[PDB]
Design a protein around this ligand. Structure first.
Ligand code: GMP
Ligand code: GMP
Ligand code: GMP
Ligand code: B62
Ligand code: B62
Ligand code: CL
Lengths: 245, 244
């Protein structure tokens, strides 16, 4: 069991954050010992936002770099911070508020696929294996010590869509164990191997390079499939076509 | 892996439904092979509705006993139906649409704690263990064949609140397995054991009887604890700590 009176601050967004809050409640963390930092109510965040209002869990939507956010953290005085698809870089001083530190879920086997769009890139690059990494947060993205990783096979029929959702689902299986590792002061291990990096931008601006091989085009089309967003674009005779995927 | 082109209708509500759709998408079920029947958008169902809108997943909020609900299922032609906290009785003729049948998640070890508010009665009644049952649905609530059960210990500090949430979390962790049972035509097993049934309201209109033992009082307090609902009353008593 988690230490009694453990104070947990969840920074997050959407279903993973809703699930994390559910998990914490299920672990017996009291409502007054849960706080959430999230973003302004969205499509993807209606679930979380309504849950927080309904249960009277304190929350902020202040920007991560704002004073209000820092005060929210400070007044709460978390023991631990759990980032569950929180979009923004969390300032180091906010992290320092939690003397048991923090954990964040990243959908790659770090230090591979640092950056964003990790699911799309894994597919673009023809990986047959990827995974997720619950890792302590340091002041930069994607760099902190690994608390838990798990491998996820990439199938030749996976899309960014299917892999993204499997990533979430599979990662949720491990969440309770991760919270316990935090609870118990598991230092985790410094990330190992060579880091790869991918830019915030949509891969190749969503545009198929005609010089790619068919295998690379197939991968890219899959990597680009993510309803409701536009699919991969093919330009022909100066004109845009969305692929059927 | 789930059979290609399997068509899945999720009848559900709130996070368990959202998690189910997420699980399906991860399993490679395409959006046009998912349909959702749910209830209106509300404070416990907006996450699901937002997902359905964002991903353009076809859905209905028609009442379970309505022609519109039936026509939604018939049009979609599910292979399987997954009920994830769907409140209402799904009519037999709707279940009949899915050749691979259905499963529903019920937060007890069926046939114990049929009915509603199972988590609160589990605590009131002093159970030391409970669990969840993924069971095929027949025409009645809570009576169909068991596909999967998992036991959950009920701790001395558990409240209706914590147990309700742990039920969901733990049950979600078995969902993928259950969907694959459905896919594979696992017949499950006929329910066996001591049936019980509890409905709706906890007794005593939330009122602590000082004749009860401290063990009874503590259980009642914990069973009544479920933000944002009022707690047990003696004046409002949200913990035994406060009670003493
Ligand atoms: N995880 C991760 N996210 C990033 C990185 N760079 C940018 N982002 C995300 O995309 C936004 C940049 O506009 C940030 O707020 C992050 O949400 C990175 O290196 N790692
Ligand atoms: N294709 C595509 N995939 C995305 C986007 N954002 C996240 N995944 C986007 O804008 N386009
Ligand atoms: N205390 C309490 N718990 C509930 C209620 N409904 C579901 N769980 C209610 O009205 N009161
Ligand atoms: C994805 C998350 C969100 N924000 C983070 N903030 C810091 N500081 N460090 C991080 O690693 C992360 N990753
Ligand atoms: C809880 C769920 C919701 N609806 C059901 N409908 C039928 N027919 N059979 C059922 O068992 C159930 N249980
Ligand atoms: Cl039970």
């Amino acid at each position: 069991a988690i230490a009694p009176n453990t104070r947990v601050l969840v920074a997050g967004y959407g279903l993973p954050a809703e699930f994390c809050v559910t998990t914490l409640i299920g672990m017996g963390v009291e409502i007054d010992k849960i706080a959430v930092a999230t973003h302004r109510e969205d499509n993807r965040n209606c679930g979380l936002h309504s849950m927080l209002r309904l249960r009277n869990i304190q929350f902020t939507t202040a920007a991560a770099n704002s004073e209000e956010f820092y005060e929210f953290g400070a007044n709460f005085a978390p023991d631990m911070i759990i980032s569950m698809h929180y979009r923004s870089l969390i300032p180091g001083r906010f992290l320092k508020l939690a003397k048991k530190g923090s954990v964040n879920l990243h959908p790659s086997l770090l230090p591979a696929y640092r950056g964003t769009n990790s699911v799309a890139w894994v597919i673009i690059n023809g990986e047959s294996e990827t995974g997720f990494s619950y890792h302590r947060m340091d002041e930069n993205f994607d760099t902190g010590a690994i608390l838990l990783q798990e491998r996820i096979s990439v199938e030749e029929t996976d899309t960014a869509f299917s892999l993204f959702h499997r990533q979430i689902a599979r990662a949720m299986l491990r969440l309770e164990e991760v919270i316990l590792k935090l609870d118990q002061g598991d230092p985790g291990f410094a990330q190992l191997g060579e880091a790869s990096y991918y830019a915030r931008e949509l891969p190749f601006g969503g545009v198929i390079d005609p010089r790619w091989s068919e295998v690379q085009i197939d991968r890219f089309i899959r990597a680009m499939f993510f309803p409701p967003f536009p699919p991969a674009v093919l330009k022909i005779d100066g004109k845009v076509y969305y692929v059927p995927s």
